[PDB]
Design a protein around this ligand. Structure first.
Ligand SMILES: CCCCCCCCCCCCCCCCCC(=O)OC[C@H](COP(=O)([O-])OCC(O)COP(=O)([O-])OC[C@@H](COC(=O)CCCCCCCCCCCCCCCCC)OC(=O)CCCCCCCCCCCCCCCCC)OC(=O)CCCCCCCCCCCCCCCCC
Ligand SMILES: CCCCC/C=C/C/C=C/C/C=C\C/C=C\CCCC(=O)O[C@H](COC(=O)CCCCCCCCCCCCCCCCC)COP(=O)(O)O[C@@H]1[C@H](O)[C@H](O)[C@@H](O)[C@H](O)[C@H]1O
Ligand SMILES: CCCCCCCCCCCCCCCCCC(=O)OC[C@H](COP(=O)(O)OCCN)OC(=O)CCCCCCCCCCCCCCCCC
Ligand SMILES: CCCCCCCCCCCCCCCCCC(=O)OC[C@H](COP(=O)(O)OCCN)OC(=O)CCCCCCCCCCCCCCCCC
Ligand SMILES: CCCCCCCCCCCCCCCCCC(=O)OC[C@H](COP(=O)(O)OCCN)OC(=O)CCCCCCCCCCCCCCCCC
Ligand SMILES: CCCCCCCCCCCCCCCCCC(=O)OC[C@H](COP(=O)(O)OCCN)OC(=O)CCCCCCCCCCCCCCCCC
Ligand SMILES: NC(=O)C1=CN([C@@H]2O[C@H](COP(=O)(O)OP(=O)(O)OC[C@H]3O[C@@H](n4cnc5c(N)ncnc54)[C@H](OP(=O)(O)O)[C@@H]3O)[C@@H](O)[C@H]2O)C=CC1
Ligand SMILES: CCCCCCCCCCCC(=O)OC[C@H](COP(=O)(O)OCC[N+](C)(C)C)OC(=O)CCCCCCCCCCC
Ligand SMILES: CCCCCCCCCCCC(=O)OC[C@H](COP(=O)(O)OCC[N+](C)(C)C)OC(=O)CCCCCCCCCCC
Ligand code: SF4
Lengths: 177, 56, 77, 123, 334, 231, 117, 340, 71
């Protein structure tokens, strides 16, 4: 049929270098700012604690660091959670269960891999029943190194995840479509 | 039949090595994955096993 | 290389906070142990769970697990 | 006490081959009977006849083993497997290990003679 | 031990003079030596193709638009196998960066509706032209261009018209490209097919659900694409990937109802009324049935007489009746 | 006909790795089948490929709240094989830190227990004391949890210069910190409703089942390796 | 159209509005693994009489309690007469409550070891 | 019409925001009882925390499990929220100062309360997760059992007033609050309001440790928002029932002398000042009650199902029937049957 | 009714004579069915009719006539 030529530009900036220069761009920036602000302000993980890393994960919630003061509530059901924290050695016996709990989280969902064991198989990397890193099983957004990561390192990893949320384009991305 | 506590230890010995315990009421794997082939603590079993898993 | 341990074997147990913890190490005269089995008190406790918890209610099973004080690094090594 | 679980059989090494074949055929019958239960539990794509075919192949593999002790061990392991399947202890991932053929074609090149094996350094 | 099922041999020579030596048995930690750019990799077919490519450790460069949509692709390859590149069709340098280092370029970029920024022409002809210009300028060894079945220049449908024009411009720019035309693809979480039939409030047809096409499994299309990627004898050929047997839309809906133990609601409407409805709903921001989709609801599949098929790739498509239960299992209710 | 439920793995009381298959006739547990090995790592297979010095950290990570007592059991085994003697100061340090480790482990066990029954506050109060002691761990060994401090032959490093005073300063107030938990728990009638005559074990069955520690001393038998086999 | 009826109408509208906002803004990507029911992470009925009995005995006791509404709304008008009548009513019901208590209706190895020498 | 609209918006906004901030107040108070801080980062001093959680949950996908009745699963939280909010239409903040001035106000409160077990009864059937079913049956049992105690205390109070208008019940308490002659009845209403709301120690209904999460295991997004909102709104509303049955509602002290000093005639200033005094009295009573809910949550371990059923049906209910006998007896002895 | 037995038994491999199913035909003697084959046909029968058959008598079935006397 009818449309036979194109006028699309040739140097349209990529999202990572795009700045909001128009009324609709500022509107969408504000809406994205609200949504990302909510996502960082209500940071709900699923606890999925497996080994010695779960102890530093509890000490995050202890009085001295008080994850709750930032808006972090650990919620038992995966249905009510945003973030999965893989804190511990992932065995071959546990891999299907982990993938199942990851699948049952509603979108949007993020995963943080805490500890050497979850990052790369760690001190049991050459064992016959250990998955050499949870990113064989679920996609991972932030890797927290340590064995076990101190509570401050885990909180720093949380801040990194929130920084990633804060730079996410939601409606601006739709506008680019 | 003599010591109740020996139940789990004998299931572990079988799982790790393959040693059978005659008269054990419920002898099955206790540690290894379901459907694991091989008895890991045998000197001829390689360190890293023969198989690994991933998401397909 | 490491120090070489005289050949032999030993079972040595201590009063760990969770009960009796012991190790059965087999030495072959070399720098690497020939065999090391750890006796974890949680293993025996969780074994006794089915005898202890029969005839109780589900919340009582929760309380029982609490009093056994299991860590599960001990249970499976 | 710690009581046995569902479909648990105490370990007993048969002193005679015939008394072992009785148990072996019983176990085979149990597996054939449980096939539909396995098909429901593990949400398999394939058919119940294929489950039963797989079971028959598994039992076939040791049809010529002679020494009695090895037969005893094989029977004990077969029963342990049956108890594992029927109690839903196993998951779908480990269950489908038994079934490598029903997955799709892995690729265009599965070498059969020396030249194709040699080209892939597998000769 | 694993095996490089996609490779015929160990040492390979690209058309561009690169020597590729596969290392390893063929598993996750192995490397085929090939590098491939998959445009539209985060889509329905791109995901399967990327999984098959990175399974054997060929480096996959994935140009993406939204960061959160591509995350599942990282799981499919070892460390450093799956690489992500920010890309946009209106940024030429971005396309150049995506194709620069590859031995294989396949593009699956196609959209079944129009947007405020990309109409059918902008997404199918100028987009393909830019990708093919990057390919020709960098002299990429293999370029695979996926179009749709029934792609004809003078079609009634803007989709098929722009698809045919895209094929023509691709052939003009890169004479050695391979053109694939798959039939309607089904499979897990497909688009405007089985999953729509399984959870729609009502399926509304303007042509009595009479249209015929040979539906093909998405896994099979991806496997055929992989085979085309790794054999150099498919250069400058056209492929018509389609399923074994011909179905009518009503037949598929009847099969879905029988497998679902639930009756699928069908309502037949006049073509003008359904056009106006679709044109109206095109005003919301989430994808919805197109006007041109209902225009295509009057076109039955037409298979080119002279076109290579699944047989030339030594492949046998699976049957849609066989997968039904596997493909729609979560809605049976029972 | 029994009803079968999968208690755990994803369950706070289960501690994340306890797939506890129970069979219920209504409310009552008829048979229980704990399934383990979700955390089987192959520690014992891996130790055979490690020097003794290299194999020591495998024990920190066994009971990952009682690190130094684990290091201590392995050290006593290896020293008994080696026929060597730990110096006096080293022995005293290992005793002090064995009891700091006991205090940490009991804080975790008691507070996790009370959190399982529903008493959420002792969790936090006792976790502040845990933080205070993990300061001492970090000061002598450099790691909060997995110290790798107690080694066959003694301890890796001598104590830092200002540690005894700080331990004593903490010890002057731990007594009150205990009294407060006891105020919430010891006499509360709901606590006694959840704990009295629950999980009863006889002396003879305690011995028969292989139980040790508090699980055995609760049944009336005075057995304590610290008093019986003075180490 | 007083405040009462308008408020009563307004509340469900607010509920429906929040629901519609959720439906409009949230993504919706169902797939088989997500649709599975959650039981601690992996796929997988007799009851006791007291379960039945709490529910069933709720209804008579509820009726007893709600039978005193006419009394407390007419206490003065019925004077010392109605007073006595409602005492008798209450005692008759208390008898049934005693029966319930004594029958233990809602509630849900000690042998010696003898050797034949 | 306009005035009606403005009154309803003012009241509705105050109630919704009070529920929203009760969650933050709970987190902060528990935090300080646990030597920690609680939310102090999302908004100044953590004052926007509740709206942050809200917005997030409204942007969350809704998951409808395969075996579930999706209509019931989505509508059950909606009806429980509606009834929880409808219950507020009769609560007065001053003499006659309410959205609904019903002569059957008490009966309305009890009825809309009795409509509160349907969320629990329906979600277990809707979720189909087994944990949800066990939680649902046990909850339905517990809630109806303690609703009996609440209704019985309602009746005992009406024995003193002989009216089902809430304002009248409050006005009769200028002489004395009913929590003075009936202190034991006030203790039981708290113990039962805790249980009827399903709060700790009596949180058996949705206890994470016995059953992961609870009946809500499967509720994501706005349905979870609805259960959450209904639960905290019901907390405040049953604290309101306690307030006007036993704590004298909006009565604080006799400010007649003070007003005669300050003012010399009726004016909008004086009407506003009186309104603020009454509302402040009633709101401070509500605040003490909500604080007590949070306090009890901080202090005690949970009950078991058997324990709480035994409590309600063997310790509380006999005492309440005994009081049924002893209150009219005391009225008869002293010739003080209340008039209509 | 026995014809249903014959139908179930007929549709099995390893036999090249469908008509050889006489009402008293032994599997191991006529049909040349294996031990495993015998268990297979027994389970096929008991499944077709839906009846569960205990271990002992199920072992003691060896022929079609025995199937019908127990059917
Ligand atoms: C405000 C009201 C809510 C807005 C709804 C938004 C919406 O439509 O999203 C649907 C949305 C579509 O889902 P999807 O992911 O696109 O999948 C759709 C299927 O794949 C298959 O999808 P499909 O291709 O079959 O399309 C189905 C189609 C249905 O299309 C039709 O069947 C219409 C056919 C008639 C055509 C001609 C009509 C006459 C033309 C007149 C001319 C004008 O529905 C629509 O897409 C509507 C599009 C227009 C939306 C208008 C919104 C405007 C406001 C902004 O459904 C969901 O997201 C599910 C969310 C979970 C729902 C749980 C709660 C629901 C139960 C509540 C019951 C209420 C009881 C109250 C008491
Ligand atoms: C208070 C809230 C403040 C935050 C306001 C907006 C931020 C949140 C917006 C947001 O995440 O939806 C994004 C769209 O993103 C936009 O670009 C869509 C345009 C955003 C609309 C903005 C409206 C702002 C005020 C809303 C009241 C995700 O939906 P989506 O693409 O999957 O599109 C749809 C949508 O989610 C569902 O309604 C459909 O049922 C489903 O088919 C799905 O495909
Ligand atoms: C608070 C602020 C709320 C208002 C948000 C501001 C949105 C700014 C949008 C700019 C308008 C650009 C436009 O043309 O949008 C048209 C859009 C369809 O655009 P398209 O991406 O092509 O989707 C087609 C899929 N069928 O269709 C839409 O965008 C529909 C958006 C309607 C939102 C109404 C909110 C009031
Ligand atoms: C107050 C707010 C009101 C908002 C309600 C609007 C609902 C729109 C959602 C929709 O389109 O249908 C959703 C519903 C989901 O059910 P279904 O997809 O058939 O099966 C899922 C099993 N996993 O699909 C259905 O089965 C439809 C059932 C509801 C019928 C309404 C038809 C809506 C058509 C959109 C125009
Ligand atoms: C309706 C469903 C259930 C109704 C519950 C009855 C609640 C009630 O008590 O209504 C009383 C109230 C007027 O009663 P009253 O106290 O005498 O008012 C005097 C004020 N000076 O009533 C009111 O103030 C307003 C009436 C509210 C209910 C109106 C609903 C109309 C029902 C018809 C539905 C049509 C379909
Ligand atoms: C759990 C929370 C328990 C808190 C209860 C607060 C009790 C104190 C307020 C009692 C209110 C009451 O019903 O009577 C108060 C009334 C005030 O008198 P007045 O302001 O002058 O009004 C004149 C008309 N009578 O008349 C009086 O002043 C009478 C004296 C006050 C009532 C007795 C006070 C002593 C008992 C307090 C114990 C409360 C529970 C502990
Ligand atoms: N599915 C079918 O039934 C048939 C499909 N086809 C063709 O198959 C190919 C893919 O099928 P499918 O995977 O189902 O399509 P999908 O929509 O699932 O994926 C298509 C890809 O196109 C990308 N895309 C679309 N427009 C643009 C754009 N303007 N700029 C950048 N990227 C863009 C999308 O990326 P984003 O996610 O960023 O939008 C998406 O990755 C398409 O070419 C389609 O025409 C042909 C015949 C049948
Ligand atoms: C709407 C629903 C109700 C929300 C109530 C609270 C809103 C707070 C908010 O939107 O937060 C302020 C936002 C985001 O702040 P930021 O600095 O971008 O990110 C904060 C990152 N932290 C958490 C690490 C500090 O400011 C903006 O850019 C948008 C300004 C307009 C907000 C309009 C609100 C209308 C109400
Ligand atoms: C009653 C209401 C009391 C709360 C108002 C003060 C909070 C505030 O205004 O806080 C500042 C907010 C964003 O808060 P923040 O991004 O978390 O910065 C907080 C700094 N730190 C260090 C604590 C992170 O800015 C805004 O856009 C305000 C717009 C919100 C309007 C909606 C209010 C709904 C009522
Ligand atoms: S990474 Fe280290 S500390 Fe963390 S779970 Fe693994 S072994 Fe324990």
């Amino acid at each position: 049929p009818r449309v036979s030529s194109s006028s699309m530009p040739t140097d349209f900036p990529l999202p990572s270098q795009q700045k909001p220069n128009s009324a609709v761009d500022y509107t969408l920036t504000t809406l994205d700012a609200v949504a990302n602000w909510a996502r960082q302000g209500s940071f709900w993980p699923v606890t999925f604690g497996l080994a010695c890393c779960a102890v530093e994960m509890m000490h995050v919630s202890a009085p001295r660091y008080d994850q709750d003061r930032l808006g972090i509530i650990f919620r038992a059901s995966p249905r009510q959670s945003d973030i999965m924290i893989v804190a511990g050695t992932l065995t071959n016996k546990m891999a299907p269960v982990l993938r199942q709990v990851y699948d049952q989280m509603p979108e949007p969902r993020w995963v943080i891999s805490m500890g050497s064991c979850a990052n790369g198989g760690g001190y049991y990397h050459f064992s016959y029943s250990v998955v050499r890193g949870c990113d064989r099983i679920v996609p991972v957004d932030v890797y927290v190194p340590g064995c076990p990561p101190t509570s401050e390192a885990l909180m720093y990893g949380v801040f990194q995840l929130q920084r990633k949320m804060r730079n996410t384009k939601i409606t601006r991305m739709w506008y680019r479509k | 039949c003599l010591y109740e506590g020996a139940n789990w230890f004998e299931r572990e010995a079988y799982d790790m090595y393959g040693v059978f315990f005659e008269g054990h009421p419920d002898l099955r794997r206790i540690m290894t994955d379901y459907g694991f082939e091989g008895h890991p603590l045998r000197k001829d079993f390689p360190l890293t096993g023969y198989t690994e898993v991933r998401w397909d | 290389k490491g120090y070489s341990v005289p050949p032999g074997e030993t079972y040595t147990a201590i009063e760990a906070p969770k009960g009796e913890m012991g190790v059965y190490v087999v030495s072959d005269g070399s720098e690497r142990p020939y065999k090391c089995k750890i006796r974890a008190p949680g293993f025996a406790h969780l074994g006794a769970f089915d005898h202890i918890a029969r005839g109780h209610f589900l919340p009582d099973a929760v309380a029982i697990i609490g009093t056994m004080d299991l860590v599960f690094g001990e249970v499976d090594r | 006490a710690i009581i046995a679980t569902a479909f648990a059989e105490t370990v007993k090494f048969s002193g005679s081959k015939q008394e072992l074949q009785k148990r072996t055929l019983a176990l085979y019958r149990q597996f054939l009977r449980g096939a539909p239960t396995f098909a429901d539990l593990y949400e398999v794509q394939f058919s119940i006849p294929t489950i039963r075919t797989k079971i028959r192949q598994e039992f076939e593999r040791h049809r010529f083993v002679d020494d009695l002790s090895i037969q005893n061990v094989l029977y004990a392991k077969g029963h342990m497997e049956y108890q594992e399947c029927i109690n839903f202890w196993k998951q779908q991932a480990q269950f489908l290990k038994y079934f490598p053929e029903e997955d799709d074609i892995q690729g265009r090149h599965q070498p059969s003679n020396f030249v194709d094996k040699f080209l892939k350094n597998r000769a | 031990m694993n095996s490089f099922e996609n490779l015929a041999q160990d040492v390979n020579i690209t058309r561009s003079g690169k020597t590729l030596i596969a290392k390893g048995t063929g598993g996750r930690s192995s490397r085929t030596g090939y590098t491939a750019t998959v445009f539209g990799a985060n889509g329905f077919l791109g995901s399967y193709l990327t999984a098959k490519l990175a399974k054997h450790g060929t480096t996959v460069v994935v140009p993406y638009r939204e960061e959160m949509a591509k995350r599942h692709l990282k799981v499919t390859g070892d460390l450093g196998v799956v690489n992500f590149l920010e890309m946009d069709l209106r940024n030429l340098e971005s396309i150049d960066e995506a194709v620069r280092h590859s031995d294989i370029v396949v593009n699956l970029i196609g959209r079944e509706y129009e947007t405020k920024n990309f109409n059918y022409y902008d997404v199918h002809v100028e987009g393909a032209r830019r990708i093919a210009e990057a390919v020709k300028k960098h002299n990429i060894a293999r370029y695979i261009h996926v179009s749709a079945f029934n792609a004809e220049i003078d079609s009634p449908s803007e989709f098929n018209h722009t698809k045919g024009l895209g094929e023509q411009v691709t052939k003009d720019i890169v004479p050695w490209a391979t053109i694939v035309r798959p039939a309607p693809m089904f499979g897990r979480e497909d688009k405007w097919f089985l999953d729509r039939m399984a959870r729609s409030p009502c399926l509304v047809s303007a042509n009595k659900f009479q249209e015929t096409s040979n539906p093909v499994h998405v896994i099979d299309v991806a496997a055929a694409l992989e085979r085309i990627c790794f054999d150099d004898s498919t250069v400058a050929q056209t492929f018509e990937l389609y399923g074994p047997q011909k179905f009518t839309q009503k037949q598929i809906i009847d099969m879905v109802s029988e497998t679902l133990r639930k009756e699928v609601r069908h309502i037949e409407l006049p073509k003008a009324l359904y056009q106006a409805y679709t044109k109206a709903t095109q005003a919301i921001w989430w994808p919805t049935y197109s006007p041109d989709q209902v225009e295509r609801q009057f076109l039955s599949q037409k298979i080119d007489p002279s076109a290579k098929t699944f047989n030339d790739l030594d492949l046998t498509p699976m049957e849609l009746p066989d997968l039904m239960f596997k493909l729609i299992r979560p809605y049976r209710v029972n | 006909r029994a009803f079968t439920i999968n208690f755990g793995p994803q369950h706070p009381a289960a501690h994340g790795v306890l797939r506890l298959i129970l069979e219920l006739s209504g409310e009552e547990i008829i048979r229980s089948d704990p399934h383990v090995g979700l955390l089987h790592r192959g520690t014992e297979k891996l130790i055979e490929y490690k020097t003794y010095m290299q194999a020591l950290p495998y024990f920190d990570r066994l009971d990952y709240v009682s690190m130094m007592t684990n290091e201590q059991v392995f050290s006593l085994a290896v020293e008994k094989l080696l026929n060597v003697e730990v110096p006096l100061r080293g022995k005293y340090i290992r005793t002090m830190f064995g009891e700091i480790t006991r205090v940490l482990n009991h804080l975790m066990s008691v507070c996790s227990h009370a959190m399982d029954v529903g008493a959420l506050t002792p969790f936090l109060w006792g976790f502040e004391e845990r933080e205070k002691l993990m300061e001492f761990y970090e000061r002598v060994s450099g790691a909060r949890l997995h110290a790798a401090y107690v080694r066959p032959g003694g301890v890796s490093q001598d104590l830092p210069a200002g540690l005894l005073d700080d331990i004593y300063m903490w010890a002057t107030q731990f007594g009150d910190r205990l009294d407060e938990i006891e105020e919430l728990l010891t006499d509360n009638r709901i606590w006694k409703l959840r704990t009295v005559n629950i999980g009863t074990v006889t002396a003879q069955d305690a011995l028969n089942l292989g139980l040790s520690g508090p699980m055995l001393r609760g049944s009336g038998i005075p057995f304590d390796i610290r008093k019986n086999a003075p180490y | 159209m007083n405040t009462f009826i308008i408020f009563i109408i307004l509340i469900p509208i607010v509920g429906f509005a929040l629901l519609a906002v959720n439906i409009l803004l949230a993504v919706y990507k169902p797939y088989n693994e997500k649709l599975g029911a959650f039981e601690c992470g992996l796929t997988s009925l007799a009851f006791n009489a007291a379960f039945i009995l709490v529910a069933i005995l709720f209804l008579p006791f509820d009726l007893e309690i709600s039978t005193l509404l006419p009394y407390v709304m007419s206490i003065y008008l019925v004077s010392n007469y109605g007073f006595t009548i409602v005492l008798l009513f209450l005692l008759i019901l208390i008898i049934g409550f005693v029966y319930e208590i004594n029958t233990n209706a809602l509630k849900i190895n000690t042998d010696s070891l003898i050797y034949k020498l | 019409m306009i005035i009606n609209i403005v009154e309803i918006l003012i009241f509705l906004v105050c109630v919704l925001f009070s529920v929203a901030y009760l969650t933050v107040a709970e987190r902060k108070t528990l935090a300080y009882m646990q030597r920690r801080l609680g939310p102090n980062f999302v908004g100044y001093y953590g004052l926007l925390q509740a709206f942050a959680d809200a917005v997030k949950l409204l942007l969350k996908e809704i998951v409808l499990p395969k075996e579930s009745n999706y209509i019931i699963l989505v509508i059950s939280p909606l009806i429980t929220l509606i009834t929880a909010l409808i219950g507020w239409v009769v609560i007065p903040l001053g003499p006659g100062i309410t959205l609904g001035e019903l002569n059957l106000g008490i009966l309305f409160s009890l009825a809309i309360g009795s409509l509160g077990v349907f969320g629990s009864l329906l979600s277990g059937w809707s979720s189909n997760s087994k944990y949800s079913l066990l939680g649902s049956i046990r909850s339905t049992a517990q809630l109806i059992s303690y609703e009996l105690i609440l209704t019985s205390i309602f009746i005992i109070i009406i024995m003193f007033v002989s009216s089902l208008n809430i304002t009248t019940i409050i006005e009769t308490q200028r002489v004395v609050w009913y929590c003075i002659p009936l202190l034991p009845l006030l203790l039981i209403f708290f113990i039962a309001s805790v249980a009827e709301t399903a709060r700790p120690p009596f949180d058996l209904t949705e206890s994470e440790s016995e059953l992961v999460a609870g009946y809500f295991t499967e509720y994501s997004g706005s349905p979870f928002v609805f259960f959450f909102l209904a639960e905290y709104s019901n907390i405040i509303l049953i604290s309101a029932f306690n307030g006007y049955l036993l704590l004298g509602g909006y009565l604080s002290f006799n400010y007649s002398y003070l007003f005669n000093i300050l003012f010399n005639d009726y004016s909008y200033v004086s009407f506003l000042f009186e309104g603020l005094i009454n509302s402040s009295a009633y709101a401070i009573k509500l605040v003490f009650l909500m604080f007590s809910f949070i306090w009890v949550r901080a202090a005690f371990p949970r009950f078991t199902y058997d324990n709480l059923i035994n409590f309600c049906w063997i310790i509380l209910l006999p005492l309440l029937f005994g009081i049924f006998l002893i209150i009219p007896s005391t009225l008869y002895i002293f010739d003080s049957f209340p008039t209509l | 009714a026995e014809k249903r037995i014959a139908a179930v038994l007929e549709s099995f491999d390893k036999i090249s004579n469908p008509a050889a199913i006489t009402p008293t035909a032994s599997f191991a003697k006529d049909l040349n069915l294996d031990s495993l084959d015998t268990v297979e046909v027994v389970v096929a029968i008991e499944e077709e009719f839906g009846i569960e058959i205990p271990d002992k008598e199920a072992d003691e079935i060896k022929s079609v006539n025995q199937a019908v006397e127990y059917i």
